Amino acid sequence: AISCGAVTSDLSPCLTYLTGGPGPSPQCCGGVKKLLAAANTTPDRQAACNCLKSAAGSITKLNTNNAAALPGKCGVNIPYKISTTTNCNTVKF
Numbered sequence: 001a002i003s004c005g006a007v008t009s010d011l012s013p014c015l016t017y018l019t020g021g022p023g024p025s026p027q028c029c030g031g032v033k034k035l036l037a038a039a040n041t042t043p044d045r046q047a048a049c050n051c052l053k054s055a056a057g058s059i060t061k062l063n064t065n066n067a068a069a070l071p072g073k074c075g076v077n078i079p080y081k082i083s084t085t086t087n088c089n090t091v092k093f
Ligand SMILES: CCCCCCCCCCCCCCCC(=O)OC[C@@H](O)COP(=O)([O-])OC[C@H](O)CO
Pocket: 005, 008, 009, 011, 015, 018, 035, 036, 039, 048, 049, 051, 052, 053, 054, 055, 056, 058, 059, 062, 064, 067, 068, 082, 083, 084
């Protein structure tokens, strides 16, 4: 497992670019790597994603476009097509 508070917090500086703002900024990428670097386990990734998935539902300016390219533009391994409708609960490590 992991700390949900750390999941969304790590995307603090990313929220901007994720909300349609400019980016991904250099300060944002820093957290993205730390967040993904932590989710090395199965139960760690499921919670991490789900955590952001819920906190994203309460957002109206959420730009799914910046969310998918967020980890990509930051040079990160993610063969996933990034789908907010995807069940992160059925994901492995
Ligand atoms: C790291 C693992 C892979 C990530 C997969 C990425 C694909 C999904 C990305 C979809 C977008 C999710 C992120 C939304 C941005 C965000 O979560 O901001 C955090 C902020 O809204 C606070 O979240 P909270 O602490 O849960 O606060 C919730 C409160 O209801 C909001 O008013």
